[PDB]
Amino acid sequence: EYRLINCNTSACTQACPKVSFEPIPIHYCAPAGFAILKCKDKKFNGTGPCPSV
Amino acid sequence: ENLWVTVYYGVPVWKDAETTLFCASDAKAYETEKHNVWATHACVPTDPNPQEIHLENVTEEFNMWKNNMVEQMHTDIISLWDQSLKPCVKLTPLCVTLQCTNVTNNITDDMRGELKNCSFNMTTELRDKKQKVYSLFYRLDVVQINNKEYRLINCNTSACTQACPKVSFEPIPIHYCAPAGFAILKCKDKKFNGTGPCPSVSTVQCTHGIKPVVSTQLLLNGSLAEEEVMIRSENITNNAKNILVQFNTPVQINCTRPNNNTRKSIRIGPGQAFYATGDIIGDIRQAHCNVSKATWNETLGKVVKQLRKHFGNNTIIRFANSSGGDLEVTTHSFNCGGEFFYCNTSGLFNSTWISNNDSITLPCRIKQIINMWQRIGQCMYAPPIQGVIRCVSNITGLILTRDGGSTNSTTETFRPGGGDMRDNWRSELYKYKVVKIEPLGVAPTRCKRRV
Amino acid sequence: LGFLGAAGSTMGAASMTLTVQARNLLSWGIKQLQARVLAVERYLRDQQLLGIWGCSGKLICCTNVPWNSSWSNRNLSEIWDNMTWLQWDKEISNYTQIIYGLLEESQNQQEKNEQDLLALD
Amino acid sequence: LGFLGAAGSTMGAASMTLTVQARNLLSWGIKQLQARVLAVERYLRDQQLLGIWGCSGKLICCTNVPWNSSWSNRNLSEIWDNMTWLQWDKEISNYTQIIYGLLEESQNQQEKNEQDLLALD
Amino acid sequence: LGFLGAAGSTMGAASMTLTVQARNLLSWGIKQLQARVLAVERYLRDQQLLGIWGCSGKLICCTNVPWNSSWSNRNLSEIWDNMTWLQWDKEISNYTQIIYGLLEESQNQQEKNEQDLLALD
Amino acid sequence: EVQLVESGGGLVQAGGFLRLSCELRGSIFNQYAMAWFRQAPGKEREFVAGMGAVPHYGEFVKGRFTISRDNAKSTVYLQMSSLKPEDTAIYFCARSKSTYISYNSNGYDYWGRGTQVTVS
Amino acid sequence: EVQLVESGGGLVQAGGFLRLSCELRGSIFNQYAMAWFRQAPGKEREFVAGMGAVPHYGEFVKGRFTISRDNAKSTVYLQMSSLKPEDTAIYFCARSKSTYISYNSNGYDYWGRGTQVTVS
Ligand SMILES: *[C@@H]1O[C@H](CO)[C@@H](O[C@@H]2O[C@H](CO)[C@@H](O[C@@H]3O[C@H](CO)[C@@H](O)[C@H](O[C@H]4O[C@H](CO)[C@@H](O)[C@H](O)[C@@H]4O)[C@@H]3O)[C@H](O)[C@H]2NC(C)=O)[C@H](O)[C@H]1NC(C)=O
Ligand SMILES: *[C@@H]1O[C@H](CO)[C@@H](O[C@@H]2O[C@H](CO)[C@@H](O[C@@H]3O[C@H](CO[C@H]4O[C@H](CO)[C@@H](O)[C@H](O)[C@@H]4O)[C@@H](O)[C@H](O)[C@@H]3O)[C@H](O)[C@H]2NC(C)=O)[C@H](O)[C@H]1NC(C)=O
Ligand SMILES: *[C@@H]1O[C@H](CO)[C@@H](O[C@@H]2O[C@H](CO)[C@@H](O[C@@H]3O[C@H](CO[C@H]4O[C@H](CO)[C@@H](O)[C@H](O)[C@@H]4O)[C@@H](O)[C@H](O)[C@@H]3O)[C@H](O)[C@H]2NC(C)=O)[C@H](O)[C@H]1NC(C)=O
Ligand SMILES: *[C@@H]1O[C@H](CO)[C@@H](O[C@@H]2O[C@H](CO)[C@@H](O[C@@H]3O[C@H](CO)[C@@H](O)[C@H](O)[C@@H]3O)[C@H](O)[C@H]2NC(C)=O)[C@H](O)[C@H]1NC(C)=O
Ligand SMILES: *[C@@H]1O[C@H](CO)[C@@H](O[C@@H]2O[C@H](CO)[C@@H](O[C@@H]3O[C@H](CO)[C@@H](O)[C@H](O)[C@@H]3O)[C@H](O)[C@H]2NC(C)=O)[C@H](O)[C@H]1NC(C)=O
Ligand SMILES: *[C@@H]1O[C@H](CO)[C@@H](O[C@@H]2O[C@H](CO)[C@@H](O[C@@H]3O[C@H](CO)[C@@H](O)[C@H](O)[C@@H]3O)[C@H](O)[C@H]2NC(C)=O)[C@H](O)[C@H]1NC(C)=O
Ligand SMILES: *[C@@H]1O[C@H](CO)[C@@H](O[C@@H]2O[C@H](CO)[C@@H](O)[C@H](O)[C@H]2NC(C)=O)[C@H](O)[C@H]1NC(C)=O
Ligand SMILES: *[C@@H]1O[C@H](CO)[C@@H](O[C@@H]2O[C@H](CO)[C@@H](O)[C@H](O)[C@H]2NC(C)=O)[C@H](O)[C@H]1NC(C)=O
Ligand SMILES: *[C@@H]1O[C@H](CO)[C@@H](O[C@@H]2O[C@H](CO)[C@@H](O)[C@H](O)[C@H]2NC(C)=O)[C@H](O)[C@H]1NC(C)=O
Ligand SMILES: *[C@@H]1O[C@H](CO)[C@@H](O[C@@H]2O[C@H](CO)[C@@H](O)[C@H](O)[C@H]2NC(C)=O)[C@H](O)[C@H]1NC(C)=O
Ligand SMILES: *[C@@H]1O[C@H](CO)[C@@H](O[C@@H]2O[C@H](CO)[C@@H](O)[C@H](O)[C@H]2NC(C)=O)[C@H](O)[C@H]1NC(C)=O
Ligand SMILES: *[C@@H]1O[C@H](CO)[C@@H](O)[C@H](O)[C@H]1NC(C)=O
Ligand SMILES: *[C@@H]1O[C@H](CO)[C@@H](O)[C@H](O)[C@H]1NC(C)=O
Ligand SMILES: *[C@@H]1O[C@H](CO)[C@@H](O)[C@H](O)[C@H]1NC(C)=O
Ligand SMILES: *[C@@H]1O[C@H](CO)[C@@H](O)[C@H](O)[C@H]1NC(C)=O
Ligand SMILES: *[C@@H]1O[C@H](CO)[C@@H](O)[C@H](O)[C@H]1NC(C)=O
Ligand SMILES: *[C@@H]1O[C@H](CO)[C@@H](O)[C@H](O)[C@H]1NC(C)=O
Ligand SMILES: *[C@@H]1O[C@H](CO)[C@@H](O)[C@H](O)[C@H]1NC(C)=O
Ligand SMILES: *[C@@H]1O[C@H](CO)[C@@H](O)[C@H](O)[C@H]1NC(C)=O
Ligand SMILES: *[C@@H]1O[C@H](CO)[C@@H](O)[C@H](O)[C@H]1NC(C)=O
Ligand SMILES: *[C@@H]1O[C@H](CO)[C@@H](O)[C@H](O)[C@H]1NC(C)=O
Ligand SMILES: *[C@@H]1O[C@H](CO)[C@@H](O)[C@H](O)[C@H]1NC(C)=O
Ligand SMILES: *[C@@H]1O[C@H](CO)[C@@H](O)[C@H](O)[C@H]1NC(C)=O
Ligand SMILES: *[C@@H]1O[C@H](CO)[C@@H](O)[C@H](O)[C@H]1NC(C)=O
Ligand SMILES: *[C@@H]1O[C@H](CO)[C@@H](O)[C@H](O)[C@H]1NC(C)=O
Ligand SMILES: *[C@@H]1O[C@H](CO)[C@@H](O)[C@H](O)[C@H]1NC(C)=O
């Protein structure tokens, strides 16, 4: 005598067959008046000055 | 003598108008995560000590009874409560026939048919199985159908959603600020009777701390008047218009629910939790309120004296208890710690005045479900609160409705009545009016635009 | 000395502080957004109405169109010393939307006379 | 005598009234708000394009950059008497986005020559 | 030669092309609308701050208010040939929101001096 | 503008049947409670019936009548029945200040023209 | 700012009962998982209990304890029962980097002051 594991914490909706989960690339752009920089140093360890920005 | 015309931009002049205002809430409580009604998580943070700057040689006239902010504020509250109940759970599955009987755990003689012990079948987390659970319901939430077979009073008119435990019903101050291009005036005359020119008018970008309370009569936690308890009205000659009495020194009222209620959780469905009263611990005692005997009698003394200025001096002013009608207008209903009260007030407005220590105790009744004043149809369910609920409050004003007696028989009887929910806010928005700044004036001078 | 800090003083003296009443003009989430668009949109209307006349952002724009004694019939020095702006507006509130039309004609006509004057060279 | 009330008339006569076609340029709830923001935003684009040139709100901005006969090769008086603006636009519709670049250069260069001219004093 | 294409160059040479950094300044669905309203709103603020000063859209607005040696204490030719704008901003970043007040006073005071000068005629 | 209209009424034989109605056009219907008042000749007004969120009746109704409000048409009906001769009077229609009903006449701010009803 | 509080604890008789609590104030409550760590004297920290989307317990809990999180008050409780004297230690409260629980102490970035619990 079994029950779904989630039927005593919270019910939840089926995933619609129409939609898909595959990764679609999403570029990001700034609005008018703003600008997005981009570092280019090969030896960039996440923090610190980036010369060729 | 020849002079020409010029146009001055940014000239200070205003016209009466109306618009849509927005949030202004204190940022101190932002860290305290509370997605409650009258939200602070989605609002413009207020400003410390707004630019309240005095004005001189200015005369402006106000009018509460045709003000627009009070009207717009109402729709703000109505539109908010509906939005705050969408995530909550409905009570459609609970509309089931109940088997109820009296509860007698050496109950006090004050109340006998007040608490009913009901038991009903309900669906557990699994749709196939069912469970027999029981709870206690107040006598005002069950009706007989045909013996012992009761149903919720509001299961044949319209189902309503439970009040989410996450949200809170306590009043949070809400400041009102005009948008760019507008300005909010503010009267400051102590002897301001609601209508007429206000000499010392001053401007401010944001109103002071306004905490809209939900009460019918004896509005609580209002802004005290500075001096000279004032009677504000629209057409005092006409008796169909309410009279908003606001007095300076507040009388403290203590309201308690000595019953030691305990909360019990029942699973309606998967993730659908319904709370209900469990077993009452200890003796059962009626919920009541107390107001100081000495101060209250003095407070009515000020009101009576300040009222004779409109109805002469040789007038026998005598108060009378509530009119009679809907349960929410006979008594006075005020929220206290998430539970709605209904307190009999016949013990206060009972006296007569001629032109020549102790504490008043009054009973109260409690309803778990209430017919929301926001709309006629949708009700709301108030979950029980554990322990003992006690809250003190400031009674700052009164809402007296005159009795339309004959011209003779100079005994003018005043009765209290809440009725409109707008009046509770009109007692606090009586100082501000919204105006529209119109630059680009015209004046004559002497020039000649060189070609 | 602040926002509308001299609305009740002499109109001539009130002219000293004019940027304060102009600088702070354009400075339940949906309700906020609709106000911001209205606020900025209202400002553009005033600026454009000045633009079509012989000035853009001078903040003191004195046109050459003649004045009418009938409109005010008040002495020039008698109004610029004692009577405030708020009272001034009511006096000419009725006589509005007719000066604006005159200003446009006096500007468009003047502009063309300036255009061909620069062309005869 | 109204909004685009002389679109089909002579282009020289079209200049008789230019403010009417410009004054009324900026004057389901969501789409209305989106339209309003687009309408005001479009007006700013037009104004800014004039700002970078040698004028702000003149409404008749005559620049000193030379004209090209190849663009139109039509007599000056022959076009300002008969041809309508709508027909005129199509003739130079192809030759667009190249005059605008020239105007910017002729203004920035002129502005700098004026800046140092006031500095040699 | 593009948007912020000369940020790291000499500030004097940075003035060669200033329109590119200004022209490209005004050009989930709710997010887009909010950004557009903010974008247009910011541009209006900047233009207004120039409007109250002695200029509207000149793009080179040289005011007559005196300069302070204490604020910079750098030679005029020493900073306009080598040092970049970004470095320049930080040097006088602290001394900001004070010059702006001075500019307004130097303009409003001058505005009336021009108004009454045209009236004595 | 706030205004109200009424139904026919008219003479009805004693112990007969009759229906009254009142339509609220100006203001919102789900934000106010309507009630009926009767004014017999040589007498003051008094409460008869009214529907807010829960029905109410006067002392002399004794359950004979029946009141219900139709949200669709924004109207309030009155299933009058068993009309005794003493019930003849002009039956007004009024709108309360808010969603609560008060037996005092001063609790309403928009009255109707008045429907004449007679019993013989 | 992210900060946490703790319940009392205190002395408990052997084989007694006790309840702990920890309220998460700063960050959102429905986006992180909380867990309890104990540090006996002269020993390193180790996992005790934690509630993300499914409960977890240490090897020595043996079902004695019970952990549940109240979404309303944004707190996590711990219904300890039958506390042996070996369980005396300081019980910390920590918040995980995300909605998953890791037995290593390095899976949490916001610890608590520590609650003293002793059994005699
Ligand atoms: C008029 O103003 C007065 C002054 O504030 C106001 O009285 C307040 O009533 C509330 C009722 O909830 C009090 O708040 C409660 O105080 C008790 C005291 O023990 C606390 O235990 C409560 O905490 C529990 O409930 C909270 C409800 O949200 C939970 O969030 C919390 O986690 C606890 O479970 C609660 O804080 C408040 O203290 C008084 N104010 C005082 C004493 O100064 C009165 O209610 C106002 N009038 C009206 C009509 O509301
Ligand atoms: C479809 O069938 C319907 C049911 O028979 C028809 O309704 C009939 O309509 C006529 C005229 O409209 C009525 O004749 C009047 O009757 C009243 C007495 O009725 C009173 O009681 C009813 C009960 O609700 C109430 O609604 C009325 O307002 C009255 O208070 C007389 O006073 C009039 O003088 C007139 O004779 C019929 O009574 C009514 N039928 C019924 C059963 O009530 C309808 O007309 C049919 N459709 C068509 C197109 O013919
Ligand atoms: C309404 O009835 C409630 C139920 O009886 C009352 O709750 C009582 O509250 C007092 C003081 O707050 C408690 O006395 C304390 O008891 C603890 C031991 O309890 C331990 O276990 C419980 C089980 O959940 C736990 O919640 C506690 O935190 C403790 O871990 C002692 O250690 C204290 O020293 C103190 O004696 C009662 O135990 C408690 N009742 C019950 C049955 O637990 C409540 O006070 C009543 N309301 C009013 C207004 O009187
Ligand atoms: C409301 O009525 C129901 C049934 O009429 C009550 O249910 C049961 O009530 C008894 C006491 O009244 C609870 O205690 C029981 O006492 C017997 C006595 O021998 C004992 O043998 C049982 O083991 C139990 O302790 C009983 O728990 C309760 N039933 C359930 C399922 O809880 C109910 O108590 C009444 N409500 C109140 C507030 O009294
Ligand atoms: C939803 O249920 C309530 C509760 O029954 C309904 O109100 C009640 O309706 C009944 C008959 O429909 C009324 O009964 C009558 O009572 C009077 C005494 O007041 C009696 O003299 C009559 O002979 C008759 O028995 C009852 O009074 C009334 N109110 C209550 C509190 O029960 C309501 O009508 C229902 N909803 C709808 C839309 O019908
Ligand atoms: C929703 O259902 C799950 C599944 O039953 C609940 O978790 C389970 O809860 C039971 C008792 O409530 C646990 O039983 C205990 O298991 C331990 C061994 O781990 C044993 O030593 C104890 O004597 C006792 O039998 C069970 O372990 C636990 N987990 C599983 C996978 O079954 C869960 O509590 C339910 N949700 C709610 C809100 O109650
Ligand atoms: C509120 O005060 C104003 C003026 O301060 C009163 O206005 C006048 O009141 C008198 C009677 O007291 C009337 O005869 C006048 O016609 C009123 N004039 C105006 C312009 O209103 C007003 O009556 C006072 N209202 C109340 C309710 O006391
Ligand atoms: C309100 O006042 C009443 C008195 O009329 C209080 O009732 C008494 O309270 C004391 C408190 O210790 C009890 O000892 C008495 O038994 C109570 N009854 C009587 C008849 O004195 C009541 O407690 C007060 N409540 C509040 C909240 O102030
Ligand atoms: C309502 O409760 C408050 C506080 O619980 C009472 O105020 C206290 O009254 C006592 C009377 O002996 C004073 O000694 C205290 O100093 C008061 N404290 C405060 C904070 O006010 C108040 O008296 C109660 N109301 C009534 C009518 O008894
Ligand atoms: C509110 O309380 C008062 C008394 O404090 C109640 O007055 C009662 O009125 C009835 C009506 O005739 C009398 O028979 C009772 O004798 C009165 N009470 C007392 C103690 O004498 C009043 O009824 C209460 N309010 C409600 C709605 O019941
Ligand atoms: C309302 O006021 C009247 C007085 O105008 C009170 O009448 C007294 O009531 C007490 C208590 O029942 C009696 O002992 C007195 O004899 C009554 N007075 C007279 C002259 O007979 C009445 O009690 C008040 N209402 C309440 C609820 O207390
Ligand atoms: C108000 O007017 C009086 C005289 O009309 C004047 O002395 C006073 O300065 C004025 N108020 C202010 C703030 O200047
Ligand atoms: C229960 O209480 C009612 C009053 O509410 C009373 O009439 C009745 O006699 C009591 N007893 C029973 C068994 O219903
Ligand atoms: C619950 O269902 C059972 C099934 O027979 C029934 O006997 C019982 O009366 C039901 N409960 C109630 C409160 O009616
Ligand atoms: C007040 O009501 C009376 C009632 O007839 C009326 O005569 C009077 O004009 C009203 N006054 C005002 C100011 O509305
Ligand atoms: C009275 O009822 C309470 C309710 O639980 C109970 O605790 C108490 O023991 C009872 N006392 C008597 C004498 O029945
Ligand atoms: C109220 O006070 C007045 C005088 O201030 C006194 O005459 C009257 O008797 C008092 N009433 C009560 C009920 O104490
Ligand atoms: C009424 O009394 C007040 C003050 O007590 C007084 O100013 C006024 O003249 C009196 N009027 C009459 C008609 O007695
Ligand atoms: C007011 O007092 C009268 C006096 O008989 C009483 O009949 C009525 O029920 C009282 N009203 C309330 C709401 O208690
Ligand atoms: C009641 O009024 C007093 C006097 O101003 C004030 O000190 C107190 O805080 C008020 N009570 C509240 C706000 O609950
Ligand atoms: C002045 O006004 C009068 C009537 O208002 C009008 O006839 C006259 O043409 C106007 N003159 C000028 C110069 O505006
Ligand atoms: C404006 O003037 C017209 C006629 O000159 C007159 O009828 C009207 O009442 C006036 N209105 C105001 C507000 O002065
Ligand atoms: C005119 O246009 C021709 C070709 O379109 C081009 O070669 C020439 O440089 C242009 N001259 C000017 C002054 O624009
Ligand atoms: C524009 O000119 C180009 C070449 O000069 C030609 O290919 C194109 O068809 C023209 N388009 C129009 C619309 O005149
Ligand atoms: C220059 O700066 C100094 C100090 O920062 C100040 O005292 C002085 O008034 C300033 N002078 C001018 C002309 O800005
Ligand atoms: C700005 O100057 C003040 C005082 O001159 C100093 O306290 C502060 O640290 C300075 N800040 C920067 C960023 O230079």
On chain E, the residues whose CB falls within 8 A of the CB of C27 are 45
In the block, residue with structure tokens 């995980």 = G96
Those residues with Cβ within 8 angstroms of residue B375's Cβ, 6 or more apart along the chain or in another chain: B78, F30, F31, F99
Cβ neighbours, 10 Å, residue G95: 22
Ligand 2 atom at minimal distance to the Cα of residue F8: 28
Query: Which residue among E22, E40, E58 places its CB closest to the CB of D40?
Result: E40
Cβ within 8 Å, pair A31-E3: no
**Tokens, residue A50:** 């980036």
Q: Which residues of E touch C37 (CB under 8 A)?
A: 37
Query: Hey, what's the torsion of the CAs at F96, F102, F104, F108, to 10 degrees?
Result: -10
Distance of CA C68 to the CA centre of its chain: 17
Specify whether the CB–CB gap between G4 and G15 falls below 8 A. Answer: no
Indicate the burial class of B290 (C-beta count within 10 angstroms; 0-12, 13-18, 19 or more). Answer: middle
Cβ within 8 Å, pair E26-D41: yes
Rounded distance between C-alpha atoms, residue B304 and residue B244, angstroms:
14
Q: Do D59 and C111 touch (CB under 8 A)?
A: yes
First to last CA, chain A: 63
CA of E74 to the centre of ligand 25 (A): 15
- Number of domains forming the structure of chain G: 1
d(Cα B111, Cα B42) in Å, to the nearest integer?
Answer: 45
DSSP assignments along B312-373, one per residue: -SS--EEE-----BSHHHHSB-BEETTEEEEE--TTTS-EEE-----EEEEEEEE-SEEE-T
Binding site membership of B143 for ligand 5 (Cβ less than 6 Å): yes
Give SS3 for C12. Answer: helix
Residue type, B251: V
CATH number of the domain to which F98 belongs? 2.60.40.10
Task: Give the C-alpha separation, D18 to D22, whole Å.
Answer: 7
Q: Which residues pair with B339 in a beta bridge?
A: B336
Separation between Cα atoms, residue B229 and residue B245, nearest integer Å:
7
User: Please, are residues G99 and G108 in contact by the beta-carbon 8 Å criterion?
Assistant: no
Q: Is the CB of B394 under 6 A from ligand 20?
A: yes
Q: Going by CA atoms, what residue is nearest to atom 10 of ligand 6?
A: G63
* Helix, strand or coil, per DSSP, at residue B28: helix
Measured CA to CA, the distance from residue B159 to residue B380 in angstroms comes to 9
Hey, is C46 helix, strand or coil? helix
Contacts of G102 (CB under 8 A, 6+ apart): G96
- What is the whole-number distance in angstroms between the Cα of residue D93 and the centre of ligand 24? 9
Q: Which residues, 6+ apart, have CB-to-CB distance to B344 below 8 Å?
A: B331, B362, B363, B364, B365
Determine the Cα–Cα distance for residues E88 and E14; give it in Å rounded to an integer: 12
Kindly state the tokens that stand for G57. Answer: 């317990």
Q: 3-class DSSP state for residue B397? A: strand
Q: Is the four-CA dihedral E87, E91, E96, E100 of positive or negative sign?
A: negative
Largest CA distance in chain E: 61
Triad G22, G23, G29: Cα angle to 5°: 120
- Mutation for testing the C interface, residue in B1, B13, B77, B438 having most C CBs under 10 Å: B13
Residue of B nearest to G71 (CA): B166
**Residue B344: count of CB within 10 angstroms of its CB:** 17
Handedness of CA B156, B160, B162, B168 (dihedral sign): negative
Q: How many inter-chain contacts (C to D, CB under 8 Å) are there?
A: 40
To what resolution in angstroms was this structure determined?
Answer: 3.6
What is the arrangement of strands in the sheet containing F4-6, beginning at the earlier edge strand?
F4-6, F17-24, F75-81, F67-70
H or E segment at E72? helix E69-72
Q: Cα separation of C27 and B347, whole Å?
A: 54
Report yes or no: B5 and C63 within 8 Å, Cβ to Cβ: yes
Asked whether the beta carbons of residue B270 and residue A3 sit closer than 8 angstroms, the reply is no
Full domain range(s) for residue F68: 4-119
Q: Indicate whether residue B301 lines ligand 17 (CB < 6 A).
A: yes
Residue nearest atom 5 of ligand 21, based on CA coordinates: C70
Among E34, E52, E118, the residue with its CB nearest the CB of C59 is E52
Beta carbons of B139 and B113 less than 8 angstroms apart? yes
Q: How far apart are CA B216 and CA B401, in angstroms?
A: 12
| B114 φ/ψ angles, rounded to the nearest 5 degrees | -110, -40
**Could you give the dihedral angle defined by the CA atoms of residues B34, B35, B40 and B41, in that order, rounded to the nearest 10 degrees?**
100
How far apart are the CA of B447 and the centre of ligand 21, in A? 20
Q: How far is the alpha carbon of D76 from chain C, nearest alpha carbon, in Å?
A: 13
Neighbouring chains of G at 3+ CB pairs within 8 Å? B
Distance B112 CA to ligand 8 centre (A): 20
Q: For residues F50 and F56, is the Cβ–Cβ distance under 8 A?
A: yes
For residue E69, which ligand has an atom nearest its CA? 25
The structure tokens 């004296």 sit at B305
- The verdict on the CB of residue B282 being under 6 Å from ligand 16 is yes
3-class state of residue B256 by DSSP: strand
Say which residues have a Cβ less than 8 Å from residue F59's Cβ, sequence separation at least 6: none
What is the dihedral sign for C-alpha B413, B414, B415, B417?
A: positive
Whole-number Å distance between alpha carbons of C28 and C31: 5
How many residues does this entry show for chain B?
A: 451
Angle of CA points B172, B175, B177, to nearest 5°: 155
D32, D41, D59: best to mutate for the E interface, most E CBs within 10 A: D41
B295 token code pair: 């101060």
**Burial bucket for residue F84 (CB in 10 Å: 0-12, 13-18, 19+):** exposed
The beta-strand segments (E) located in A1-53 are none
Nearest-angstrom CA–CA distance, B400 and B321: 11
Nearest to B255 by CA among B168, B341, B348: B341
Positive or negative torsion for Cα B420, B424, B429, B434: negative
For residue B137 and ligand 14, the question of a CB distance below 6 A is answered with no
Ligand 3 center to B387 CA (angstroms)? 11
Spacing, Cα A20 to ligand 19 middle (Å): 68
The domains of chain D are located at 4-118
Query: Residue F102 and residue B240: Cβ atoms within 8 Å?
Result: no
Query: Per the structure block, which two tokens stand in for B177?
Result: 């600020």
Q: Which helix (H) or strand (E) holds B306?
A: helix B293-311
**Which numbered ligand comes closest to the C-alpha of C1?**
12
- Contact state of C19 with E52 under an 8 Å Cβ cutoff: yes
Give the rounded distance of the alpha carbon of G59 from its chain centre.
15
Q: Which residue carries 């003035």 as its tokens?
A: E15
E-facing residues of D in 48-77 (CB < 8 A) are 48, 51-52, 56-57
Directed axis angle between helix E29-52 and helix E99-117, to 10°? 50
Cα gap B262→B280, rounded to integer Å: 7
